[PDB]
């Protein structure tokens, strides 16, 4: 019953998941110059060659790529992370007008929308093991800003229209995440939770430096998606983001000088 509305929107979440008001919440401003280098970090490989797409699906939150975490075909490695993680899904957040829409915030400044790539710990043997370990998972998170059009969003932007409404789901073999990101992996990190309810204080966040540019008519169909079902009242799926959370007793690292 959770959403964005006035009345079901991230003020009320607390109620029904009270680790809402918890230590380690997310997102978070990402204030640059209080952020440190840190030269413990090892390199970081995102290693999505053998990536196995499945099926994209309207959640009535957001709508979901899904991947088969089977096998170690798609994973993130490195960087602040102890072992391997294994990609499990990639999703968006985004705003009703440009000006808004990312979860993350770099120095209060809010992008358009935000990627989530998601990622399980495999050490944990599942997903909802992981679900239940302080370092369960780790989001790779990457801002959208708009400006001229990403050729490797376009055909998650033409399936949207068979997904309009909650409940449904289309085929969405042989997509290549790599067509989402930007040319540089530099990053922030820092320890948090899922953004969304049950708000698990999980997730080991890999926030990117670099926006990836977006056109404005590629946004503009992701506002087209709708949080209702089939048959129900139209409401359009925007503003599916949680505004920034205390940073509480937490340190943001930064990858580079
Ligand atoms: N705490 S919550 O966001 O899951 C929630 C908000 C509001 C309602 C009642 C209105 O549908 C129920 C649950
Ligand atoms: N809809 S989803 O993205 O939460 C999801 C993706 C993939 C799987 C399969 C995990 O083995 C389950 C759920
Ligand atoms: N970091 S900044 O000063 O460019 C900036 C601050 C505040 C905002 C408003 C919210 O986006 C935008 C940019
Ligand atoms: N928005 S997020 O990436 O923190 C997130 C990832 C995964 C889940 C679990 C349900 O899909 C919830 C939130
Ligand atoms: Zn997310």
Redesign the pocket.
């Known amino acids: 019953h959770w959403g964005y509305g006035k009345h079901n929107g991230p003020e009320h979440w607390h109620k029904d998941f009270p680790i809402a008001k918890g230590e380690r919440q997310?997102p978070v401003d990402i204030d640059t110059h209080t952020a440190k280098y840190d030269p413990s970090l090892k390199p970081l490989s995102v290693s999505y060659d053998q990536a196995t797409s499945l099926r994209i699906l309207n959640?009535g939150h957001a709508f979901?790529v899904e991947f088969d975490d089977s096998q170690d075909k798609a994973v993130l490695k490195g960087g602040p992370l102890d072992g391997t993680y294994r990609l499990i899904?990639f999703?968006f957040?985004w705003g009703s007008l440009d000006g808004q829409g990312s979860?993350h915030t770099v120095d209060k400044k809010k992008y358009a929308a935000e990627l989530?790539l998601?990622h399980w710990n495999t050490k944990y043997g599942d997903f909802g093991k992981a679900?239940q370990q302080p370092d369960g998972?780790a989001?790779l998170?990457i801002f959208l800003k708009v400006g001229s059009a990403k050729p490797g969003l376009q055909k998650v932007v033409d399936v949207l229209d068979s997904i309009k409404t909650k409940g449904k789901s289309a085929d969405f073999t042989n997509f290549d995440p790599r067509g989402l990101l930007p040319e540089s992996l530099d990053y922030w990190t820092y320890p948090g939770?899922?953004?969304?309810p049950?708000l698990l204080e999980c997730?080991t966040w890999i926030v990117l430096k670099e926006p990836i540019s977006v056109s404005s008519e590629q946004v503009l169909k992701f506002r087209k998606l709708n949080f209702n079902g089939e048959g129900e009242p139209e409401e359009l799926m925007v503003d599916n983001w949680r505004p920034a959370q205390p940073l509480k007793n937490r340190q943001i690292k930064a990858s580079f000088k």
């Open positions: 997310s959640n979901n899904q999703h957040h979860e989530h998601v679900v998972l989001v998170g939770s899922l953004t969304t049950p997730v």
